[PDB]
């Protein structure tokens, strides 16, 4: 019959359906710019070390909660990027690269050096400089705006955000303590801490639990939530991590 020509064409279709074309690669639509090669090397490194912990734990499956970003605003085109940590400190990444981190009293003023990566300067709000007066006006505006109509909350040093990157599927946060946090369009979140060994999961309804990664991989899924597509989400993390680990010049 002509079913032979049909069955053969069918078979070739199934083979081709197992390969890719027009497949999405991670593209950053927004990220803070780092004007230091050394700063990038430190970032790239941290991505590699943390990735290694994932991969080591991936080939090897056969509880302290990390600091996280509770809310954020990418206003990069106007004022700058803002965020709030589980410590309820507020940071603002200014478009020049500098940062002001106001504690829960005082604030840190951060920027980077071509010879020393990141540089920080602690101040008292009492003793704030006149030159940094506009910065804290912007922080004050971000602090109040974020309180009013952004929603989330969390329950041994000062931590700031070195790098954020917004992809279509998720926004990725690189904190200064080596923690990585991923916010998915699924409204599911997870944070990778402690060299890649520990994984934290935050729910759409804001339930958060920290678990060893080996265990979670022993489960084959986060224990509470089956709706969370963990395998795919851990794959995106890995793709995101690897991409950054090679960004060492700009």
């Amino acid at each position: 019959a002509q079913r032979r020509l049909n069955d053969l064409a069918r078979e070739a279709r199934i083979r081709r359906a197992q390969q890719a074309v027009l497949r999405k690669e991670l593209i950053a639509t927004s990220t803070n710019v780092i004007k230091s090669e050394i700063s990038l090397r430190i970032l790239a490194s941290e991505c590699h070390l943390t990735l290694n912990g994932i991969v080591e734990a991936e080939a090897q499956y056969k509880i302290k909660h990390p600091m996280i970003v509770t809310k954020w605003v990418d206003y990069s085109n106007k004022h700058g990027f803002s965020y709030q940590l589980s410590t309820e400190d507020i940071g603002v990444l200014f478009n020049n690269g500098t940062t002001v981190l106001r504690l829960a009293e005082e604030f840190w003023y951060i920027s980077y050096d071509d010879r020393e990566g990141w540089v920080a300067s602690h101040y008292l709000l009492s003793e704030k400089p006149r030159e940094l007066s506009r910065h804290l006006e912007v922080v004050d505006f971000f602090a109040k705006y974020m309180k009013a109509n952004l929603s989330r909350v969390s329950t041994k040093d000062d931590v700031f955000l070195r790098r954020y990157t917004r992809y279509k599927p998720f926004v990725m946060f690189e904190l200064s303590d080596g923690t990585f946090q991923f916010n998915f369009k699924d409204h599911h979140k997870m944070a990778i801490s402690d060299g890649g060994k520990l994984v934290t999961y935050i729910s759409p309804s804001h339930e958060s639990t920290t678990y060893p990664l080996v265990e979670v991989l022993k489960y084959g899924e986060i224990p509470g939530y089956p709706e969370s597509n963990f395998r795919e989400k851990l794959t995106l993390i890995k793709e995101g991590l690897k991409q950054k680990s090679t960004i060492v010049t700009v």
């Binding site: 809310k71 605003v73 990418d74 206003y75 085109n77 109509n149 929603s151 409204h187």
Partner: peptide, 7 residues
Amino acid sequence: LAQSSPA
């Protein structure tokens, strides 16, 4: 302009 989940 983008942001996290609203209140």
